[PDB]
Design a protein around this ligand. Structure first.
Ligand SMILES: [Mg+2]
Ligand SMILES: [Mg+2]
Ligand SMILES: [Mg+2]
Ligand SMILES: [Mg+2]
Ligand SMILES: [Mg+2]
Ligand SMILES: [Mg+2]
Ligand SMILES: [Mg+2]
Ligand SMILES: [Mg+2]
Ligand SMILES: [Mg+2]
Ligand SMILES: [Mg+2]
Ligand SMILES: [Mg+2]
Ligand SMILES: [Mg+2]
Ligand SMILES: [Mg+2]
Ligand SMILES: [Mg+2]
Ligand SMILES: [Mg+2]
Ligand SMILES: [Mg+2]
Ligand SMILES: [Mg+2]
Ligand SMILES: [Mg+2]
Ligand SMILES: [Mg+2]
Ligand SMILES: [Mg+2]
Ligand SMILES: [Mg+2]
Ligand SMILES: [Mg+2]
Ligand SMILES: [Mg+2]
Ligand SMILES: [Mg+2]
Ligand SMILES: [Mg+2]
Ligand SMILES: [Mg+2]
Ligand SMILES: [Mg+2]
Ligand SMILES: [Mg+2]
Ligand SMILES: [Mg+2]
Ligand SMILES: [Mg+2]
Ligand SMILES: [Mg+2]
Ligand SMILES: [Mg+2]
Ligand SMILES: [Mg+2]
Ligand SMILES: [Mg+2]
Ligand SMILES: [Mg+2]
Ligand SMILES: [Mg+2]
Ligand SMILES: [Mg+2]
Ligand SMILES: [Mg+2]
Ligand SMILES: [Mg+2]
Ligand SMILES: [Mg+2]
Ligand SMILES: [Mg+2]
Ligand SMILES: [Mg+2]
Ligand SMILES: [Mg+2]
Ligand SMILES: [Mg+2]
Ligand SMILES: [Mg+2]
Ligand SMILES: [Mg+2]
Ligand SMILES: [Mg+2]
Ligand SMILES: [Mg+2]
Ligand SMILES: [Mg+2]
Ligand SMILES: [Mg+2]
Ligand SMILES: [Mg+2]
Ligand SMILES: [Mg+2]
Ligand SMILES: [Mg+2]
Ligand SMILES: [Mg+2]
Ligand SMILES: [Mg+2]
Ligand SMILES: [Mg+2]
Ligand SMILES: [Mg+2]
Ligand SMILES: [Mg+2]
Ligand SMILES: [Mg+2]
Ligand SMILES: [Mg+2]
Ligand SMILES: [Mg+2]
Ligand SMILES: [Mg+2]
Ligand SMILES: [Mg+2]
Ligand SMILES: [Mg+2]
Ligand SMILES: [Mg+2]
Ligand SMILES: [Mg+2]
Ligand SMILES: [Mg+2]
Ligand SMILES: [Mg+2]
Ligand SMILES: [Mg+2]
Ligand SMILES: [Mg+2]
Ligand SMILES: [Mg+2]
Ligand SMILES: [Mg+2]
Ligand SMILES: [Mg+2]
Ligand SMILES: [Mg+2]
Ligand SMILES: [Mg+2]
Ligand SMILES: [Mg+2]
Ligand SMILES: [Mg+2]
Ligand SMILES: [Mg+2]
Ligand SMILES: [Mg+2]
Ligand SMILES: [Mg+2]
Ligand SMILES: [Mg+2]
Ligand SMILES: [Mg+2]
Ligand SMILES: [Mg+2]
Ligand SMILES: [Mg+2]
Ligand SMILES: [Mg+2]
Ligand SMILES: [Mg+2]
Ligand SMILES: [Mg+2]
Ligand SMILES: [Mg+2]
Ligand SMILES: [Mg+2]
Ligand SMILES: [Mg+2]
Ligand SMILES: [Mg+2]
Ligand SMILES: [Mg+2]
Ligand SMILES: [Mg+2]
Ligand SMILES: [Mg+2]
Ligand SMILES: [Mg+2]
Ligand SMILES: [Mg+2]
Ligand SMILES: [Mg+2]
Ligand SMILES: [Mg+2]
Ligand SMILES: [Mg+2]
Ligand SMILES: [Mg+2]
Ligand SMILES: [Mg+2]
Ligand SMILES: [Mg+2]
Ligand SMILES: [Mg+2]
Ligand SMILES: [Mg+2]
Ligand SMILES: [Mg+2]
Ligand SMILES: [Mg+2]
Ligand SMILES: [Mg+2]
Ligand SMILES: [Mg+2]
Ligand SMILES: [Mg+2]
Ligand SMILES: [Mg+2]
Ligand SMILES: [Mg+2]
Ligand SMILES: [Mg+2]
Ligand SMILES: [Mg+2]
Ligand SMILES: [Mg+2]
Ligand SMILES: [Mg+2]
Ligand SMILES: [Mg+2]
Ligand SMILES: [Mg+2]
Ligand SMILES: [Mg+2]
Ligand SMILES: [Mg+2]
Ligand SMILES: [Mg+2]
Ligand SMILES: [Zn+2]
Lengths: 204, 13, 174, 140, 37
RNA sequence: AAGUCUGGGCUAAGUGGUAAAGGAUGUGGCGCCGCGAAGACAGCCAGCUGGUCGAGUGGCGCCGCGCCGAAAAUGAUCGGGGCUUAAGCCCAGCGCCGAAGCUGCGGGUCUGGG
RNA sequence: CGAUGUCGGCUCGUCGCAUCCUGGGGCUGAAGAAGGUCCCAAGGGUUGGGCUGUUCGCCCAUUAAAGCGGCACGCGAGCUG
RNA sequence: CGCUGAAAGCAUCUAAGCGGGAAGCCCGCCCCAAGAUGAGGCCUCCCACGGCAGCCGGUAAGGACCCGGGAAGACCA
């Protein structure tokens, strides 16, 4: 397993073999390994990666310590990649070649308090023929005296989005190492400027 | 299946 | 009217060690461990092994014959050894060896490659005969069965993989 | 005269090797130790039972066909949220839970019985991390 | 396979076997194969 | 709360812990026939008879306890945990626990007799 | 009976399995393909219309299939009427 | 559906033992998750304060308040 941290920069399409292919551009590199988790010490295996450099004026003393023990300049984001242990002290985009499939994780756009139609694709109610103030309502939510209650997990209105989402098996269309750029085919969760994680795919 | 109502439709107070 | 008490001739020269819960039968073709009930007593006599049971109740009578045959099969295995033969009937159908492994051509869109497990050897005389040989009788019988399964005998045509000396029963077809 | 009531005393730590013992029949004894009903100054409303350490919980023994037929159950509160787990698999995945679940069901319900369960330390494998307390070996 | 509450010998070559807590009837004629249930 | 009590036996289904016609080489125990050291039954060697095998073998009925037959709707369960020469069932015992019943002690009322 | 709102539809499900499809099987009067019949299996799926208030049913065009039931004949402090 | 195999000289998937076998079951995938009071782990920072497992007084690492805001959001977060 291998992975890198990155920010989602935006979307476009490029042309390849007389085909328009939708892409999301990702600024991935460069990520210094700042800590390594070991089976002897941590009970599992992963690499703590750093991303984006940080104004030392904002780095508190416990954080300062952590970076210093790794001989690493202050970084904005710390995140682990599981079962990944790179030989180098720095992870860059070059760990991906064009043609590989990857899994991208982000924080989905937040819809705030969402209705049951947006959130769960409910049909809602009729818009004429007598419908009385229930056009976007969920209808019945249960039975009667048996069971006399509502199931846990009952789909209802509530917050929606701003949540971890991983879309899987995306084609790497291109990589531009001199600019720390990844071009992945299709869509990636979250807004432009959002932090994403690019891992080698688990699909076969 | 159609069976006879056992209550009248509610009239106003 | 009895198996367990009938004694087991032991050819010169195979050894039959006895441990609690098992017997070890070494011979000219290899070794084999026979797991044996603690309730049964094995006996090593001159050129003969006997198995004795404690009571004459159901479980004991049953374990008896079993144990004797189990050990007798181990003896014959390390001396004579065991083997089963397969006949391959059907026009397109043929077998061949590729190294140690067996390659079946039995009418699929591919050929089937069977790998020999430890203690099992494959032989192909004619391309229509297969010999499964080994010192373990249950293992030879098993692997043999496995091979036959790949393309069982048809019900309407003399076609497929057959046991040596297996009768060809067929049904009419329209 | 009024009945003697004990002031707080030091609890006895105890070691038990579960290997080869019948699940339920061992569980009974552990519960008794936990309740402290072997002590002549027993009192129903205080924790004055022993601390019981058990090792080789994976080598607990069971009669009949219960390895594949005894079924542990868990309800999640969700629709269809009833999980069924056989003895065989419970031992394969979390073997100490087997003995734990047995003893827990034989302790009183309520605040006290929950405390008594906490004084039960069960381990798979012959080693236990309680050298400091030096528990007295018990033959049961 | 026939699955019945009354499993019986159908012909002289039928054999009443009992395996795994269930009464079967195995035989040379495949039509006679029975399991109780 | 009081026996992991004692002795004999059965059951291997968790039967016990939810049911019927009927079905079954389940298991244990009785009973009655048939055949057989003049060689039966099973297998190998022939034509219901013969050859070596050298023991039993085939059938009917009854009793105890079990097996199937046995599909329903929110989450399961013999009250639970858990129980298999029992913590199940049948037979015979000894001891204990157990109610506001009975006893001991103290008291109150009414009634009867002093 | 000092009130437990009653058919059908809509919305939202969830369970059962005596399984409509899909998966795995045995038998077939199973040549092949396609069926029949029984067994295992409840993971998912189980279309859009014409008529009628209809549930149901018939019909059109399809479909892998167009399953049958329980949940106060599920669901009117959710809507319809 | 078998392999080996007695009880029961044969036979038998079974009584010892071993295989093969489902969109189902367990894992695997994705998301939540240590109030998992059984409250876990690792890295790093502060630290031995003054007065009579307690109280009071000021601090340390840090945190909050306040403000500019935000594809975060009803308020809160
Ligand atoms: Mg781990
Ligand atoms: Mg690794
Ligand atoms: Mg809106
Ligand atoms: Mg909307
Ligand atoms: Mg949505
Ligand atoms: Mg709508
Ligand atoms: Mg609609
Ligand atoms: Mg609409
Ligand atoms: Mg209106
Ligand atoms: Mg209105
Ligand atoms: Mg309106
Ligand atoms: Mg509504
Ligand atoms: Mg209502
Ligand atoms: Mg309820
Ligand atoms: Mg949120
Ligand atoms: Mg693809
Ligand atoms: Mg992240
Ligand atoms: Mg009517
Ligand atoms: Mg003998
Ligand atoms: Mg034999
Ligand atoms: Mg014909
Ligand atoms: Mg025991
Ligand atoms: Mg014990
Ligand atoms: Mg004790
Ligand atoms: Mg045991
Ligand atoms: Mg078992
Ligand atoms: Mg529910
Ligand atoms: Mg579920
Ligand atoms: Mg259910
Ligand atoms: Mg209680
Ligand atoms: Mg049938
Ligand atoms: Mg019949
Ligand atoms: Mg007959
Ligand atoms: Mg038989
Ligand atoms: Mg089976
Ligand atoms: Mg047969
Ligand atoms: Mg006893
Ligand atoms: Mg049963
Ligand atoms: Mg039971
Ligand atoms: Mg039962
Ligand atoms: Mg009956
Ligand atoms: Mg009987
Ligand atoms: Mg003869
Ligand atoms: Mg049953
Ligand atoms: Mg039921
Ligand atoms: Mg009902
Ligand atoms: Mg009771
Ligand atoms: Mg007894
Ligand atoms: Mg009284
Ligand atoms: Mg008195
Ligand atoms: Mg007087
Ligand atoms: Mg009324
Ligand atoms: Mg009222
Ligand atoms: Mg009311
Ligand atoms: Mg009503
Ligand atoms: Mg009401
Ligand atoms: Mg509606
Ligand atoms: Mg409508
Ligand atoms: Mg509508
Ligand atoms: Mg439901
Ligand atoms: Mg329904
Ligand atoms: Mg079924
Ligand atoms: Mg039916
Ligand atoms: Mg239909
Ligand atoms: Mg099918
Ligand atoms: Mg099917
Ligand atoms: Mg079919
Ligand atoms: Mg035909
Ligand atoms: Mg076939
Ligand atoms: Mg035909
Ligand atoms: Mg039928
Ligand atoms: Mg079929
Ligand atoms: Mg039918
Ligand atoms: Mg039917
Ligand atoms: Mg299903
Ligand atoms: Mg379900
Ligand atoms: Mg359903
Ligand atoms: Mg329609
Ligand atoms: Mg219509
Ligand atoms: Mg019209
Ligand atoms: Mg109309
Ligand atoms: Mg209609
Ligand atoms: Mg109808
Ligand atoms: Mg009609
Ligand atoms: Mg079809
Ligand atoms: Mg229709
Ligand atoms: Mg219909
Ligand atoms: Mg129908
Ligand atoms: Mg039905
Ligand atoms: Mg339905
Ligand atoms: Mg209903
Ligand atoms: Mg009704
Ligand atoms: Mg209805
Ligand atoms: Mg209704
Ligand atoms: Mg309905
Ligand atoms: Mg309904
Ligand atoms: Mg209602
Ligand atoms: Mg209304
Ligand atoms: Mg209505
Ligand atoms: Mg109401
Ligand atoms: Mg066969
Ligand atoms: Mg055989
Ligand atoms: Mg077995
Ligand atoms: Mg058995
Ligand atoms: Mg198997
Ligand atoms: Mg096979
Ligand atoms: Mg699939
Ligand atoms: Mg968390
Ligand atoms: Mg997380
Ligand atoms: Mg915590
Ligand atoms: Mg956490
Ligand atoms: Mg913590
Ligand atoms: Mg850990
Ligand atoms: Mg100092
Ligand atoms: Mg200081
Ligand atoms: Mg001081
Ligand atoms: Mg400060
Ligand atoms: Mg927002
Ligand atoms: Mg704001
Ligand atoms: Mg605020
Ligand atoms: Zn027959």
């Amino acid at each position: 397993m291998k992975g890198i941290l990155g920010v989602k920069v935006g979307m476009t399409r490029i042309f390849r073999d007389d085909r328009a292919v939708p892409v999301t551009v990702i600024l991935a590199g460069p990520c210094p390994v700042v800590q390594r988790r070991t089976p002897e010490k941590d009970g599992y295996t992963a690499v703590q990666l750093g991303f984006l450099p940080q104004n030392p004026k904002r780095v508190n003393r416990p954080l300062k310590g952590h970076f210093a023990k790794a001989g690493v300049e202050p970084v904005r984001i710390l995140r682990e990649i599981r079962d990944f242990n790179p030989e180098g002290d720095t992870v860059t985009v070059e760990i991906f070649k064009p043609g590989e499939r990857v899994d991208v994780t982000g924080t989905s756009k937040g819809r705030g308090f969402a209705g049951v139609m947006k959130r769960w694709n409910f049909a809602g109610g009729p818009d004429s023929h007598g419908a009385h103030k229930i056009h976007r309502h969920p209808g019945s939510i249960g039975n009667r005296k048996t069971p006399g209650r509502v199931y846990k997990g009952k789909k209802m209105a509530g917050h929606y989005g701003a949540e971890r989402v991983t879309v899987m098996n995306l084609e790497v269309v291109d990589v531009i190492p001199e600019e720390n750029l990844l071009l992945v085919k299709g869509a990636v969760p979250g807004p432009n400027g959002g932090l994403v994680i690019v891992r080698e795919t688990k699909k076969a | 299946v159609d069976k006879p109502p056992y209550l009248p439709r509610p009239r106003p107070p | 009217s009895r198996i367990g008490r009938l004694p087991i001739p032991v050819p010169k020269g195979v050894s039959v060690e006895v441990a609690p819960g098992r017997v070890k039968v070494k011979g000219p073709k290899g070794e084999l461990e026979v797991p044996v009930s603690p309730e049964m007593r094995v006996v090593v006599e001159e050129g003969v092994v006997r198995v004795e049971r404690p009571s004459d109740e159901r479980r004991h009578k049953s374990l008896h014959g079993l144990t004797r045959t189990l050990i007798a099969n181990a003896v014959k295995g390390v001396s004579e050894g065991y083997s089963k033969e397969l006949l391959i009937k059907g026009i397109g159908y043929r077998a061949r060896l590729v190294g140690r492994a067996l390659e079946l051509t039995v009418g699929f869109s591919h050929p089937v490659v069977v790998e020999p497990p430890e203690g099992i050897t494959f032989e192909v005389p004619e391309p229509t005969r297969v010999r499964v040989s080994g010192i373990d009788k249950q293992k030879v019988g098993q692997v043999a069965a496995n091979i036959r399964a790949i393309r069982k005998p048809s019900a309407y045509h003399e076609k497929g993989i057959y046991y040596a000396g297996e009768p060809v029963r067929l049904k009419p077809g329209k | 005269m009024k009945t003697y009531v004990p002031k707080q005393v030091e609890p006895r730590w105890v070691l038990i090797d579960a290997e080869g013992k019948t699940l339920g029949r061992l569980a009974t004894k552990i519960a008794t130790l936990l309740r402290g009903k072997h002590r002549p100054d027993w009192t129903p409303n205080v924790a004055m039972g022993d601390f019981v350490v058990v090792v080789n919980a994976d080598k607990i023994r069971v009669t009949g066909k219960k390895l594949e037929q005894k079924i542990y159950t868990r309800y999640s509160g969700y629709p269809g949220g009833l999980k069924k787990i056989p003895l065989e698999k419970m031992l394969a995945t979390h073997p100490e839970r087997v003995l734990e679940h047995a003893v827990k069901g034989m302790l009183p319900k309520g605040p006290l019985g929950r405390r008594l369960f906490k004084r039960l330390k069960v381990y798979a494998g012959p080693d236990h991390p309680h050298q400091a307390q030096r528990p007295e070996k018990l033959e049961v | 396979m026939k699955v019945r509450a009354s499993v019986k010998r159908i012909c002289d070559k039928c054999k009443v076997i009992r395996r795994h807590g269930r009464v079967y009837v195995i035989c040379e004629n495949p039509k006679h194969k029975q399991r109780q249930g």
